[PDB]
Amino acid sequence: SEGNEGVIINNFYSNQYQNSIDLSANATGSDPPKTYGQFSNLLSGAVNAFSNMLPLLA
Amino acid sequence: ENLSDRVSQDTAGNTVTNTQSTVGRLVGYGTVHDGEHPASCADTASEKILAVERYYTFKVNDWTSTQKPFEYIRIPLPHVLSGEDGGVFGATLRRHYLVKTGWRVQVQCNASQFHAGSLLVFMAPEYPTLDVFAMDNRWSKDNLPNGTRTQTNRKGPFAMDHQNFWQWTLYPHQFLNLRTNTTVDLEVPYVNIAPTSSWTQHASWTLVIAVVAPLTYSTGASTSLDITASIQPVRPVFNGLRHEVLSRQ
């Protein structure tokens, strides 16, 4: 059930603050999101296709 | 080691050449000998002899540290293959008056990644050879670049056998650069003053091997690099059958 609290008013602090956050873990693991934000260093020119090419060795 | 789109084979009869470091086949004048009959001959030609359309392989010489730039070795055609080393080619050639053919060559020379140097291999029509049309014996810088003039012709500007080697690359050629390749492949079509040739007195094409960047290496590296060649007559067509030349020499 619930405890000993019987106030009519909506809790002034939201729940994620008033209480701990119950989480549940699934047995088989979970995939991290793909990206944690948009910060990134980028590697360009990695590959090919296009230059002063095919004078270039085989 | 040698790679992939650089690994290449060429089958000629019962003959096949393989290289693991090619740079492609340079086809001079951009055409190949078609094997067509000479329009100046009423007689039907003997053509398509399998025993003749193959590669003849023999050694040219030795490349050493000593060669200087532009020293060369000449291999007159068809003459070099008219003897015993010419097999059925030679044998057929000595009994015909006339021959019409193209040439397909491969010259070979290996060193290592610790050697430095480069050869220039070219093929040239009407290149001035020895009188007797034989392969040069030793490397020479003989009669370059103004030709051979008469003893007394003290003030003559030059002779018609001049050869300005600074321009030898105008000829169908390929470089044998030790850091890059081990073989050079060339092919030339038929070219002459007439529709077919009286080969007996004319060496219309010469295969030339010249040093352009002298051989360099540190101690313990191989010291003399042999140079060998594989030559194949391309669709030779013979006419004017008679007895044997004989003095084949």
Swiss-Prot record, chain A:
The entry's comment on post-translational modification says: Myristoylation is required during RNA encapsidation and formation of the mature virus particle.
Signal peptide extent = none
The organism's superkingdom is given as Viruses
Protein residues bound to RNA: 14, 16, 18, 21
Q: What does this protein do?
A: Lies on the inner surface of the capsid shell. After binding to the host receptor, the capsid undergoes conformational changes. Capsid protein VP4 is released, capsid protein VP1 N-terminus is externalized, and together, they shape a pore in the host membrane through which the viral genome is translocated into the host cell cytoplasm. After genome has been released, the channel shrinks.
Instruction: Output this protein's name.
Output: Capsid protein VP4
What is the protein's species of origin?
Answer: Mengo encephalomyocarditis virus
Lineage runs: Viruses, Riboviria, Orthornavirae, Pisuviricota, Pisoniviricetes
From Swiss-Prot, chain B:
Localisation: Virion; Host cytoplasm
Which superkingdom, per the lineage? Viruses
Q: Which residues form a coiled coil?
A: none
The entry's function note states: Forms an icosahedral capsid of pseudo T=3 symmetry with capsid proteins VP2 and VP3. Together they form an icosahedral capsid composed of 60 copies of each VP1, VP2, and VP3, with a diameter of approximately 300 Angstroms. VP4 lies on the inner surface of the protein shell formed by VP1, VP2 and VP3. All the three latter proteins contain a beta-sheet structure called beta-barrel jelly roll. VP1 is situated at the 12 fivefold axes, whereas VP2 and VP3 are located at the quasi-sixfold axes.
Name the record gives this protein: Capsid protein VP2
User: Per the UniProt entry, what species is this protein from, by scientific name?
Assistant: Mengo encephalomyocarditis virus
Q: Which residues of the full protein are shown?
A: 145 to 393 of 2293
